[PDB]
Amino acid sequence: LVPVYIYSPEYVSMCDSLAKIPKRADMVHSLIEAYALHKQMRIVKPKVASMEEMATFHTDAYLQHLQKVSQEGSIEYGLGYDCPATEGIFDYAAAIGGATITAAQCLIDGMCKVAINWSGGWHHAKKDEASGFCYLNDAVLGILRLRRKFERILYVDLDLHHGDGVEDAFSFTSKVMTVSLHKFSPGFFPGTGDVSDVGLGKGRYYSVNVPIQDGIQDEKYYQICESVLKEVYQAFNPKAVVLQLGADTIAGDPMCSFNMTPVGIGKCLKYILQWQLATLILGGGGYNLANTARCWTYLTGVILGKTLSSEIPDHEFFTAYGPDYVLEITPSCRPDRNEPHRIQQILNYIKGNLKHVVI
Numbered sequence: 001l002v003p004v005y006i007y008s009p010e011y012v013s014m015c016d017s018l019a020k021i022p023k024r025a026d027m028v029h030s031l032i033e034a035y036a037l038h039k040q041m042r043i044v045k046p047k048v049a050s051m052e053e054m055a056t057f058h059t060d061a062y063l064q065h066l067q068k069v070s071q072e073g074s075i076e077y078g079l080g081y082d083c084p085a086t087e088g089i090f091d092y093a094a095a096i097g098g099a100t101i102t103a104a105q106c107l108i109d110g111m112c113k114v115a116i117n118w119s120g121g122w123h124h125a126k127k128d129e130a131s132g133f134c135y136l137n138d139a140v141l142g143i144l145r146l147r148r149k150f151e152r153i154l155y156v157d158l159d160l161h162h163g164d165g166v167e168d169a170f171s172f173t174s175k176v177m178t179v180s181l182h183k184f185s186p187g188f189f190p191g192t193g194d195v196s197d198v199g200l201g202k203g204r205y206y207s208v209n210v211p212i213q214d215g216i217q218d219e220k221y222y223q224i225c226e227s228v229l230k231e232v233y234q235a236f237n238p239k240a241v242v243l244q245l246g247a248d249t250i251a252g253d254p255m256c257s258f259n260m261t262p263v264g265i266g267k268c269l270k271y272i273l274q275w276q277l278a279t280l281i282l283g284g285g286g287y288n289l290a291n292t293a294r295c296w297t298y299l300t301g302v303i304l305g306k307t308l309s310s311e312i313p314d315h316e317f318f319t320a321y322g323p324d325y326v327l328e329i330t331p332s333c334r335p336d337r338n339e340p341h342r343i344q345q346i347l348n349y350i351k352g353n354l355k356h357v358v359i
């Protein structure tokens, strides 16, 4: 009944080894540790993914390329921003992939009902292409592992960006339903995920996309999320949940799009947790490093049912938490561009889609 926390010092080191979002994994763990939350969790060392395990989703060519350049340093694999240093990407991918598979296996084995991998959630990676800071799609690997036991998986993606890599992976199946809430605007990455994108073939109506505009705040976001998830839960009756909680929705993120705080995301998390299903918790985006640690530490508190002290405790990264040194994040003074009539249209459209879903 205690949550599983996927962690080792070696894993945190590997997760920070590419320095794409410098030291973020260490900041997140260090803040969790400073609040002593790890003492309330079952700490599990992640396994490293085998080639075979990564190949349940990624192509041999892509994986063999990563392994080759790990040894020796031309096809487009999405690696063109990594020329100064590609040799570490294979081990990074095997670590992230293994950690999420380990979390999924803990759920399968009934070790826990909630398993956390805050340095996973890399939802944009394609079978044969890195994308959007994602080199391996560990979320897909986790869902595939859960499908060995659970007959219907719900994937919920609350990252600022559309979870295109995961949606695409399961587009043709009705056994995995993907739900993504995200900014959707012409020109905005990755460009996919309009409300009319509902999946394909046998998977038609088993993808759910909620396009949202700049400036959304906690209350309206939760109303939208609760509305959709209530309908999804009734229609699809999931047996396990994978939840991606990218913190690039949070006020202060350089993405500067949504205007959320961790309390709003936490209400979404609480709604999902009260289903009492096996739940795999993942991180993802989050580019204000201190705020991302604030967010995921607060959400770890939510999982544990604990109220955390407002004051950030002294720890390795304490200087980064200025100028106010508190856990709470204040929304930015920016307008909400979400008009109530369009949001209601979107909800109504999704309701119509979900009427088709029959288990």
Ligand SMILES: CC(C)[C@@H]1NC(=O)[C@]2(C)CSC(=N2)c2csc(n2)CNC(=O)C[C@@H](/C=C/CCS)NC1=O
Binding pocket: 081, 124, 132, 133, 159, 161, 189, 246, 248, 284, 285, 286
């Ligand atoms: C500078 C920013 C634009 C940054 N990008 C980059 O640092 C690089 C590596 C340098 S230039 C570039 N990528 C680029 C050109 S076109 C394109 N990216 C489309 N991809 C995105 O916009 C993803 C997007 C990431 C989204 C997080 C998804 S959780 N990236 C970025 O915010």
Ligand SMILES: [K+]
Binding pocket: 157, 158, 159, 160, 161, 162, 163, 180, 181, 182
């Ligand atoms: K999303």
Ligand SMILES: [K+]
Binding pocket: 170, 171, 172, 173, 174, 175, 176, 177, 178, 199, 203, 206, 207
């Ligand atoms: K699907």
Ligand SMILES: [Zn+2]
Binding pocket: 159, 160, 161, 246, 248, 284, 285, 286
């Ligand atoms: Zn994102």
